């Protein structure tokens, strides 16, 4: 990974120096939290998309683990802006990470507080999905509203499964059999002119999902939030997923069954395009979501 | 901090201070690591590692679950484990082998990161009984997290349950499965005794404990009838005895659950006998169980 | 027997006696068929089929779930459906389109049997309210059977619930989902009314009824507030009204569930108004709903 | 399908004449029951394997549907023997089927009794499995102890999924996440010399499974019955499945993870071979399971 | 409990006579239904909050158990007004109860119909001050799940149901918390041992769906009040961690009124104390029940 | 119910005095525990079946609710023997009961400790004849599931639990059946509204696993008896259709003894009448409880 200078607990250092004890609690028990934040190039230079909203979730994830982050939100935000500038990035993916150190290896993480923190970044047909044989964890098994390290063993298993089956991404159902979300994407589907966003259920409350719903509504679409089954998606006119890295990705096939016309549909493509216009500063109406680094 | 000393890092030992890895390591972000807990006990004939092969086999089995490739043959890992005891001059210690996905990429898919990085570290190492509290967090279903493997990510569930129990004033947490049945402790297999019979809980969503396996064999050799069953919280509440097993936990009696005393309210005779015979076995004082020991020197 | 008369068999009509298929047909052994329920009502301007396109669209959608190929374009099927009414001289009738996997092979995998065989048949076709009993059979979870499609196999579940209710002295069965919440009748979507508000049950594991959709539109046009929610059996027990919808069932008031009277214990005013407006709509007596009708002659 | 003469409600008729109304209840609602019975060639001619046991289950399946079979067990057995003789079969698969006719199309099948019956027959590396995203129905959703037509929509979905993913067969989990069985095979796994048969849970009580357990025990193996998870199979020394058509089939890989050595193992191969010896009349000890037609 | 005169099947009697056979079906099998109604003192005398709505539920709960209440709703309402008057109470908690008697002890309660009915009322010993309200309630998620909708009738106030509430409450208290937060069997948030839950996030007030919870009248009242004040209210299903990161969390109930929640599972909610929204809702709610809100007088039944 | 003299917290009193406050916690929240014990007449006087085992469970049920029973097990056992003697009973049903009193009415029952205790006993009005036994009981699977192990304490005889049993029993009766068969939330067979289930298939006797059911003493007794007679007994989890195709099905309970099941959900079991195994087990069981089986005298406690 070409990260370059990484912010390590207060100070930037060369990538090669950004290391941590192999006895770190997080490395053994998945006790870490992270975020996914993107910077896009605009006519006025790099702009970070919904920075504060992402940082807030970062601290929220930490609270779920009762993990203590030894920095104020403002400092992390400044670190995030600086990881872009110092590395001379224009368009990049920023990865803040807080993890429990190597003070002790009992399964209880509290003794390891405060958490160590770092911020790294690196320059940045229709998706085919397969329904995973791995269900997304119930809300009382793993904290699904938080981006906690350990949670992604579940995403990792589903992703490898999908790829091995010849698809691009996995669609996970909850333990009851209802659609949940992709290994790392929130789901949407369109039917008879109406855009359906799936309820939060056990899924993460996506910021891209949020942005897409606002944009859809601003464009005049009717948007409903519902619980959905796989066959509701099979027969939808369109299906698409959202996420910081994934942006707005159309889904043209699920479980080898074509969605609608079998290729990216007009609604998803339009939302994606307007979303890209929003993140690149071409829409005054969404300027409030941007934080120009320069 | 942890006083581990020399740590085996992918083929060679290095000072603990040098045993570090990139913060961009896949496992540090996604919980994609596997580990083991192995113990060496002091015996009249030097340190002896308890059931080393079974532990290493499970280490590789856990890796297979994540489709993780361990770039070392089992024999090499076993040697590294014996050497971590020697080189550090340990007599009694907890050994922690760990394999994790490195920093080649950060997509959720771990495969592009193979082979895994590997390290082995180690550090020198009842009457009243333990007090448990049933967690408000259920152990993950068999199709949510691989409960038969010691996969790093799995322990977020254990961590949450453990903090909860300690916060409530208990020693350890007792987790139920999503259906409401007893599963296991945050990191211990459960047993209970009623009317002379020893009940080992079914594997269900729990890890197939090696200590559990040992205590069952021992119990049968002592002449106890052992049954494997599914259990509810109130079946434990009215048990004569309840105890936990684990490499670190060994055999620990449980005297109270959810503020309800178990039997007499103190460690029971059955759990104590099992514990005593187990400690005799791991310390080379039981000829019939010598096959379970691997002498370091 | 059934008096269907001329039946459309894969492209052409034949006497009912000739409308037969191999007993080695995949669908006869594995439930691999899909079907629809469509009605034609008599109007001052001749027979009219209610929402023909929506029904045909669902027919194809159901086929997609089984990855079944229907060797006919929607337009041809729609024509066959109009012709089944004409050729038999029906004025009011129930139309049953059916596509099933033939007899090319009997491995559980249906794909080798594509394309599907297709046929369309039809046969000529409240106050006290219906009595329901909650079934001891739960409607299948969304990852067990495709509850959004009218797949033949799905109805073993419906058949079991229906026989049970009738045996218990009730008219129809009310099924719950595996979690314990109300799902739907053996073949009817459920609604309930409380304090002036009409509650349509969420789709959950139920079929997305076309009659349900019609009654919701009608209800809103009449000025009623309509909410879509999840419901428990006792929320129905204390409702002012409860009613069922389906192509065959139309709009049927429910006066009792599990021997517990609903509201006054007879059909309620809201269900009756919805029913009345629906029958006016399907009989061409509502200009605003003409788009839902397809006149045969 | 080359079936030849088919027994149709009391009398044999040419295949082409073995037809039923497209208005048959079973064709619309999956209300039928069937069996899978095999005949193997022996030195003394064709021998049907565990005939009576299969017929008993046939009638048992019917009781679950409250379906009335208008023939006595003895008659069906005679029909089954005759479908082999008359067609001059040596080794074949026999398929008895009872289905609800076209008397009425209400979802309730009772009015359609008695059921129509027929009996047809036709001459007869390690399997790679993938875990299905379709769970086998709970015991209060579909009658899993009976071979009821409608049940197989669930098997059909799982099978197509597996094949489409590049595997040979699907492994289904129950709704709780535990291993259930294949789309149409009971599961077994071996670990440290012990043979583990999965409990019945929501699975069909396989006759091949039964035979295999008896054989295993007769051979001296220790056999236990347990509930199992997918990772218990992932780490087993061996895994295999049973069924009339499948016989004893070794499983060398599940979800792209090799089982043991990655090829058919010694235990499964041995059980399979002894099973074939039993069904072909080479084992006096199992002669009781055979019914010679000639 | 100092109840004084208690209405027993049609007539008032001293508490000492308000007793029933220890062979009563309900004492052995939880076959009873009850209500929790409050009378708040006003300058015009005691006013009972939403009496008919509570009485309708009392009868609705009885229908679930197929229990027959041998009195017209109007008789019960009169009894409820009189228990207040006859005891000279001002503010007080009213507890109507209908239970299966001692005719027989088979599990089937039908042979025991009609049910016996009683209405008792008593005064409060103490009230939480504003300081305590502001500190907020501390919750702990219970290891006991609220019963699925096909196990126990969650929309009815059936006695047997409260064994579940009792287990969770004792658990929470033993853990050092004030109240328990129960999840449903699926892992989602249900309600307190006896309180409906709400949470506020980014300006929006979220009321939890009914799922397996009781359809609280205080919950209903709070929603109406919130909307009348201009707040946006949404009804959703929620997880424990959605509450952990909410700006505010609060619970409702006749006895609990509107109670701010400052911490759940040792994780502070928002600022760690009661927030402005819950406190504002509590105030308006109290102004409503004490007859100081003209727009809500329709909810009050003055005893005098 | 004609109980006569009833033991009330340490002393016997006429039934008429055996009453408790209608403000008792258990009457409002199902917070009670009870037992079902029988005394069978013998030529040596009444003999109580497995008294200590029943008493141990009574106390075990109390521990689940964290209910304090202010009497030593020995005192209760004496009370149980005396209720029989003092009423001059021969064969009779004994019902011990401990319930939370009227100290306070918050859901938490702890403030109400210690619990009140009573022991009542009464005679049977009628018994099933062999003809009825042979016809067998007809069951119907309930639409109510037995509570999961983390919702209601299924191993304890807690009053509140029986709301679930009551709902299922009424349902079965209304449907025209004799008893209800409940499944667990997962869809598997649990037990009757108050009876443990067994089924026989191809010579083997299958006792159902404990899962969420009560660990029946009659169930335990039947298993011991079956094995002593040479039958092979296996313990398994079962589905409704495994019972549909069983050779025989029967249920056990103190009141139900050993009852043959001839039909479930309108589907006949085996021959459609009681089978030889269940009838044989019932006979030996009855010979045991009536003191005609020397090998089982250890299970009997003679009152005189
Ligand atoms: C990060 C993530 C998402 C996407 O959320 P965004 O805020 O839109 O980036 C979706 N699902 C999971 C499981 C995630 O971790
Ligand atoms: C390691 C572990 C155990 C104990 O297993 P042993 O082989 O006996 O050390 C039990 N449960 C969990 C979750 C574990 O990780
Ligand atoms: C056909 C059917 C309905 C009714 O749907 P309509 O489109 O209104 O005819 C409801 N439930 C099930 C299970 C059905 O098969
Ligand atoms: C027929 C069948 C089997 C195999 O049973 P055998 O009696 O061994 O042929 C296994 N599973 C299912 C679902 C089946 O239908
Ligand atoms: C009584 C009760 C409430 C509160 O409802 P209100 O009508 O507002 O008094 C909430 N939950 C439960 C379980 C209750 O019994
Ligand atoms: C009392 C009871 C039984 C019977 O148990 P026995 O000890 O044999 O009397 C069975 N099920 C339930 C739910 C019970 O309460
Ligand atoms: N698809 C990717 C993410 C989400 C996203 O930003 O689309 C989830 C897994 C971990 C990496 C991020
Ligand atoms: N209680 C501890 C362990 C198990 C054990 O060895 O008892 C599980 C959590 C991770 C550390 C090990
Ligand atoms: N009640 C009937 C239907 C639905 C309907 O049209 O109301 C479902 C079962 C199959 C026949 C149709
Ligand atoms: N694999 C096949 C069967 C089972 C068997 O005989 O192995 C199940 C699906 C329907 C055809 C039979
Ligand atoms: N916390 C109390 C109640 C609710 C209430 O009024 O807040 C529920 C249990 C039964 C008594 C009432
Ligand atoms: N059928 C009755 C009992 C069991 C029995 O003794 O059979 C359970 C409910 C409570 C009374 C006892």
């Amino acid at each position: 990974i070409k990260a370059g200078l990484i912010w390590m607990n207060g100070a930037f250092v060369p990538q090669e120096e950004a290391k941590t004890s192999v006895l770190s609690h997080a490395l053994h028990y998945g006790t870490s939290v992270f975020e996914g934040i993107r910077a896009y190039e605009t006519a006025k230079g790099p702009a970070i998309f919904r920075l504060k909203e992402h940082v807030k979730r970062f601290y929220n994830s930490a609270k779920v683990l009762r993990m203590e982050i030894p920095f104020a939100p403002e400092e992390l935000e400044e670190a995030i802006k600086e990881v872009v500038r110092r590395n001379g990035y224009r368009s990049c993916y920023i990865r803040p990470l807080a993890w429990m150190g190597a003070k002790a290896l009992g399964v209880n993480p509290l003794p390891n507080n405060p958490a160590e923190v770092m911020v790294a970044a690196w320059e940045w047909k229709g998706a085919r999905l397969i329904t995973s044989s791995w269900a997304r964890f119930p809300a009382n098994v793993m904290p699904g509203k938080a981006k906690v390290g350990g949670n992604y063993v579940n995403s990792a298993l589903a992703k490898m499964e999908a790829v091995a089956a010849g698809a691009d991404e996995a669609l996970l159902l909850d333990e009851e059999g209802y659609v949940a979300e992709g290994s790392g994407e929130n789901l949407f589907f369109v039917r008879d002119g109406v855009i359906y966003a799936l309820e939060h259920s056990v899924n993460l409350e996506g910021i891209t999902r949020d942005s897409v719903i606002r944009i859809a509504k601003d464009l005049g679409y009717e948007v409903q939030v519902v619980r959905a089954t796989r066959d509701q998606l099979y027969m939808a006119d369109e299906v698409f997923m959202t996420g910081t890295a994934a942006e707005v990705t159309p889904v043209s096939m699920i479980d080898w069954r074509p969605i609608g016309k079998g290729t990216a549909g007009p609604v998803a493509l339009r939302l994606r395009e307007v979303y890209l216009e929003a993140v690149t500063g071409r829409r005054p109406e969404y300027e409030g979501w941007l934080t120009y680094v320069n």
Side-chain angles (χ1 to χ4, degrees), chain A residues 1-15 17-67 69-89 91-124 126-260 262-294:
Chain A
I1 302 179
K2 314 296 181 177
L5 300 182
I6 294 176
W7 187 83
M8 279 279 289
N9 287 286
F12 288 86
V13 302
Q15 192 177 320
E17 300 189 8
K19 298 184 183 297
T20 190
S21 172
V22 297
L23 295 178
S24 289
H25 200 271
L27 197 65
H28 299 236
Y29 310 124
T31 45
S32 69
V33 300
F34 66 87
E35 268 298 329
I37 314 179
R38 279 217 53 187
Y40 288 83
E41 177 68 308
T42 70
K44 298 175 184 174
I48 301 177
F49 190 67
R50 302 192 73 172
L51 173 60
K52 288 178 178 174
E53 197 69 37
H54 275 284
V55 172
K56 181 193 285 184
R57 193 165 65 190
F58 190 64
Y59 282 79
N60 278 165
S61 298
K63 180 190 295 183
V64 179
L65 284 180
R66 293 184 63 188
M67 159 192 277
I69 296 183
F71 299 90
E74 13 288 340
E75 297 183 64
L76 269 64
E77 296 168 3
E78 181 49 46
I80 289 166
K81 295 177 182 177
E82 286 181 47
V83 72
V84 181
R85 300 164 182 158
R86 305 201 178 194
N87 287 299
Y89 286 143
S91 288
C92 58
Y93 179 83
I94 305 155
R95 169 60 63 82
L97 175 79
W99 75 97
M100 299 309 290
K103 290 183 177 185
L105 280 179
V107 80
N108 180 352
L110 290 177
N112 301 64
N113 273 312
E116 305 190 23
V117 189
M118 78 86 189
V119 178
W122 49 85
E123 199 74 328
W124 185 273
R128 294 165 69 171
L129 308 185
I130 269 170
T131 296
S132 178
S133 63
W134 293 95
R136 184 168 172 80
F137 32 67
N140 67 328
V141 171
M142 297 292 273
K145 300 290 163 291
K147 294 179 96 54
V148 169
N151 288 11
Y152 300 81
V153 156
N154 177 267
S155 294
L157 289 170
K159 188 51 174 290
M160 294 189 285
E161 180 188 21
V163 173
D168 304 304
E169 178 66 72
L171 180 68
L172 293 75
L173 310 177
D174 54 34
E175 199 59 271
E176 288 61 57
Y178 287 99
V179 175
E181 62 161 301
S183 71
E185 304 84 354
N186 287 130
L187 273 288
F188 288 75
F189 68 95
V190 187
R191 187 61 185 281
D192 304 337
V194 182
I195 293 174
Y196 295 91
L198 304 200
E199 307 187 322
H200 292 307
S201 69
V202 289
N203 312 310
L204 195 90
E205 294 173 344
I207 289 170
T208 306
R209 169 182 181 286
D210 182 77
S211 309
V212 174
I213 292 171
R214 179 64 266 162
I215 292 176
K217 287 180 178 172
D218 285 343
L219 291 179
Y221 291 103
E222 171 184 351
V223 176
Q224 280 186 50
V225 178
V226 302
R227 170 176 52 171
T229 67
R230 62 199 298 172
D231 38 346
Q232 275 180 302
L233 301 191
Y234 291 160
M235 63 176 68
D237 295 322
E238 294 186 51
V239 170
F240 61 91
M241 52 194 174
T242 63
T244 291
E247 294 171 340
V248 177
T249 302
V251 172
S252 52
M253 180 178 276
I254 301 174
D255 298 318
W256 316 109
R257 298 176 176 73
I259 304 303
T263 62
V267 179
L269 287 174
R270 188 186 180 193
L271 293 184
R272 179 186 171 76
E273 169 56 25
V274 180
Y275 174 81
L276 295 177
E277 287 170 30
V279 302
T280 56
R282 310 308 294 169
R283 297 255 172 179
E285 59 258 46
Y286 302 120
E287 276 300 311
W289 287 333
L290 282 57
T291 290
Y292 297 85
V293 307
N294 292 299

